[PDB]
Amino acid sequence: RSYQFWDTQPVPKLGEVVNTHGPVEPDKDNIRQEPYTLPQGFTWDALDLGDRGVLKELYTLLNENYVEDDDNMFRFDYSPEFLLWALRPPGWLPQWHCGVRVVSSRKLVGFISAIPANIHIYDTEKKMVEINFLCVHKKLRSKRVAPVLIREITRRVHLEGIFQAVYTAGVVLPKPVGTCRYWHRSLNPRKLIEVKFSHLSRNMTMQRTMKLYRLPETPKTAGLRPMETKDIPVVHQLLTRYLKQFHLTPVMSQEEVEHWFYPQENIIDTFVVENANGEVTDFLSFYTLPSTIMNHPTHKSLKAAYSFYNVHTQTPLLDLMSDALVLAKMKGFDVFNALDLMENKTFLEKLKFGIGDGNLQYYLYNWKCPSMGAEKVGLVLQ
Numbered sequence: 237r238s239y240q241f242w243d244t245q246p247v248p249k250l251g252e253v254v255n256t257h258g259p260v261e262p263d264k265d266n267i268r269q270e271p272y273t274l275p276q277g278f279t280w281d282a283l284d285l286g287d288r289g290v291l292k293e294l295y296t297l298l299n300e301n302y303v304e305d306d307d308n309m310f311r312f313d314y315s316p317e318f319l320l321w322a323l324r325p326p327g328w329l330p331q332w333h334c335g336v337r338v339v340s341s342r343k344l345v346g347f348i349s350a351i352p353a354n355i356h357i358y359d360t361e362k363k364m365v366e367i368n369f370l371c372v373h374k375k376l377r378s379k380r381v382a383p384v385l386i387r388e389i390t391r392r393v394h395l396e397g398i399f400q401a402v403y404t405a406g407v408v409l410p411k412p413v414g415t416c417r418y419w420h421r422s423l424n425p426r427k428l429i430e431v432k433f434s435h436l437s438r439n440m441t442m443q444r445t446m447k448l449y450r451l452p453e454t455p456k457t458a459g460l461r462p463m464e465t466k467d468i469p470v471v472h473q474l475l476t477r478y479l480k481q482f483h484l485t486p487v488m489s490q491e492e493v494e495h496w497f498y499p500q501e502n503i504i505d506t507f508v509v510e511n512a513n514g515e516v517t518d519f520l521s522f523y524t525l526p527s528t529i530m531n532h533p534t535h536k537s538l539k540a541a542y543s544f545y546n547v548h549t550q551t552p553l554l555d556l557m558s559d560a561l562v563l564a565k566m567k568g569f570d571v572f573n574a575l576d577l578m579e580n581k582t583f584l585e586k587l588k589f590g591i592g593d594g595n596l597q598y599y600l601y602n603w604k605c606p607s608m609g610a611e612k613v614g615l616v617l618q
């Protein structure tokens with residue numbers, strides 16, 4: 237409708253037909269040197285996530301105050317080591333871990349982050365940032381703190397000479413460049429139904445539901461194994477080639493591919509397929525992100541795996557994704573989550589995913605381009 241903060245920003249208007257490609261406003265040769273002012277009694281604090289205490293403050297802020305589902309029944313519970321993986325990739329900067337503290341008690345009440353990313357958007361590649369983990373404490377909601385955090389990260393990114401950003405959100409803002417539905421594949425239906433993430437079809441009993449969701453105990457594809465250090469270059473080569481077919485994608489160096497894919501227990505899993513010749517031809521990956529089951533007496537945490545990047549050249553994608561489900565089930569996950577981006581629509585129904593109840597919107601800051609279908613979005617943010 238109208239957007240008091242967003243209408244002031246270099247982004248297209250909702251329902252502006254965009255034909256051109258490029259920035260919304262010219263690049264700045266003078267940047268504001270003073271931080272934006274917070275309301276009385278609050279202060280900025282850049283968070284040193286290498287200090288275990290401070291990282292545990294951020295873990296607690298997000299565990300108590302970050303994204304919930306539409307029913308206010310589940311809340312993300314990013315672990316401390318996951319936060320390090322997501323917030324310290326190659327090129328991370330300390331001033332881009334932007335905290336807000338109560339001056340008197342020092343309590344952490346706000347956060348926003350930027351990390352650097354090279355982004356391929358249609359026929360342009362540009363150095364941008366990815367914005368994530370914007371959070372204001374429940375007690376501070378609806379006081380227009382969020383646009384101060386957004387302006388302040390913007391200023392800190394401008395100081396580094398960067399004028400574009402990419403970000404996702406559940407809410408509709410001016411103006412999505414793509415819209416993706418999330419979908420969910422049940423791995424432990426009795427639990428999912430007990431905690432009311434899922435319901436039992438009116439037309440299926442529990443016994444039938446367990447059989448419907450049952451998977452084999454070991455993956456089908458020959459030569460599947462975890463990614464090792466020797467696979468970093470071929471994973472990088474495969475992913476670079478595979479991404480060319482999408483219109484919004486990252487461009488990762490070999491060091492960024494090692495950061496984002498080399499396995500870390502309970503954070504990131506990557507498995508490659510190594511054929512009879514010793515060549516790696518395919519890989520699957522998914523990250524670990526549990527959700528707190530709010531106010532529930534029994535089950536406290538929902539264990540969820542999320543589809544990350546899956547590259548196929550010799551193994552059909554259908555089988556690579558069946559493999560990912562099997563591996564997730566083996567590792568104790570309750571549910572396997574995926575978006576309808578890249579070629580995912582080719583497998584979601586076939587593999588018994590059910591559609592969820594919302595959208596994840598994709599956005600660029602200060603770049604106008606035409607919007608794209610979900611199938612052409614080739615970028616996954618944590």
Ligand SMILES: CCCCCCCCCCCCCC(=O)SCCNC(=O)CCNC(=O)[C@H](O)C(C)(C)COP(=O)(O)OP(=O)(O)OC[C@H]1O[C@@H](n2cnc3c(N)ncnc32)[C@H](O)[C@@H]1OP(=O)(O)O
Binds near residue numbers: 238303394
């Ligand atoms: C060149 C560099 C550029 C870098 C910057 C690029 C842009 C980055 C943008 C950030 C990308 C974030 C990526 C992620 O992390 S998405 C994850 C966002 N986090 C959560 O959903 C956690 C739970 N919720 C919260 O912590 C608060 O509800 C948040 C902080 C989300 C809003 O706090 P609060 O509810 O207390 O609101 P307010 O009164 O202070 O502010 C109201 C204003 O804020 C606009 N709003 C509300 N939600 C969002 C949102 N998710 N993206 C952008 N704008 C949002 C809203 O339309 C209104 O603007 P307008 O309608 O008046 O215009």
Ligand SMILES: Cc1nn(C)c(C)c1CCOc1c(F)cccc1-c1ccc2c(c1)c(CN(C)C)nn2C
Binds near residue numbers: 306310573592
């Ligand atoms: C389980 C569960 N626990 N909670 C607390 C929720 C919301 C679910 C639903 C999770 O739905 C997704 C999925 F199935 C696959 C891929 C992405 C998602 C998703 C959706 C909305 C999302 C995100 C990520 C992110 C994280 N980041 C910015 C991408 N922010 N918001 C607003």
Ligand SMILES: [Mg+2]
Binds near residue numbers: 372376377379380
């Ligand atoms: Mg607020």
